[PDB]
Amino acid sequence: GFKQDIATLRGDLRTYAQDIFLAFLNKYPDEKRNFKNYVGKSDQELKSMAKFGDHTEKVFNLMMEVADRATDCVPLASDASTLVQMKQHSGLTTGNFEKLFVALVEYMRASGQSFDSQSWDRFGKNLVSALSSAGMK
Ligand code: HEM
Ligand SMILES: Oc1cccc(-c2cccc(O)c2)c1
């Protein structure tokens, strides 16, 4: 289920983080407006860029903690408010997060593995809900 999937992802987190973020960027190329350093690079080139690996892993480090602190796939209000208020998220709207989670769920579905894709789909919807309640446009 969802708790075990957090463990699974944490057990190889930089790999999963990069692969899921690449799935996102490749599915939604316009999303690179927010990541201008990542333009004009293949996946292998991005995995060679120090900030790509560093930053993407730190995104998923926090994402896994938000998932772990959730109840029934519903994040804490404090976690949602942190994600809204972060200066690095100034530009963002809930649609950006929706898209991240669509890509993450598709990645899990296409993996060979027994991820609880349903629970991640709910988590994404519930996080988007919580971001809106905490004041994200
Ligand atoms: C639950 C989902 C997310 C979490 C937990 C999260 C967390 C983080 C964290 C921890 C950082 C700092 C990274 C660092 O400085 O090393 C960061 C930066 C950033 N995040 Fe988020 N983030 C999430 C979703 C998103 C989404 C959906 C977008 C846009 C589509 C986004 C855009 C940014 C940008 C532009 C930065 C700074 C630029 C960069 O780090 O390259 N984040 N985020
Ligand atoms: O390196 C970064 C820094 C900020 C955010 C992300 C990100 C954004 C959308 C999907 C996703 O999986 C990861 C990646």
Give a structural overview.
The structure is a monomer. The chain has 137 residues and is mainly α. It has one domain. The protein has seven helices and no strands. The chain has helices at 2-10, 13-27, 43-46, 50-69, 77-85, 94-110, 117-133. The longest helix is centred in the middle third of the chain and has 20 residues, at 50-69. The radius of gyration is 14 Å and the shape is globular.
- Please count the helical segments: 7
Ligand names: protoporphyrin IX containing FE, (1P)-[1,1'-biphenyl]-3,3'-diol
Report the end-to-end length measured between terminal Cα atoms: 31 Å
Write down the Rg: 14 Å
Total beta strands: 0
Give helix and strand order, one letter per element, not per position.
HHHHHHH
Structural class determined from secondary elements: mainly alpha
Taken from the alpha-carbon principal axes, the silhouette is globular
Helix content: 55-70%
Total domain count: 1
Binned strand content: under 5%
Q: Note the main sheet.
A: none
Outline of the structure:
Helix content is 66%, strand content 0%. It is built from 7 helices and no strands.
Which key phrases capture this entry?
monomer; Dehaloperoxidase B; about 140 residues; peroxidase activity; binds protoporphyrin IX containing FE; heme; oxygen carrier activity; about 0% strand; Globin; mainly alpha; binds (1P)-[1,1'-biphenyl]-3,3'-diol
Write the layout of secondary structure elements.
Layout: H1 2-10, H2 13-27, H3 43-46, H4 50-69, H5 77-85, H6 94-110, H7 117-133
Helix pairs in contact: 1-4, 2-4, 2-6, 5-7, 6-7
This protein binds protoporphyrin IX containing FE and (1P)-[1,1'-biphenyl]-3,3'-diol.
PDB class: oxidoreductase
Keywords: peroxigenase, oxidorductase
Assembly: monomeric
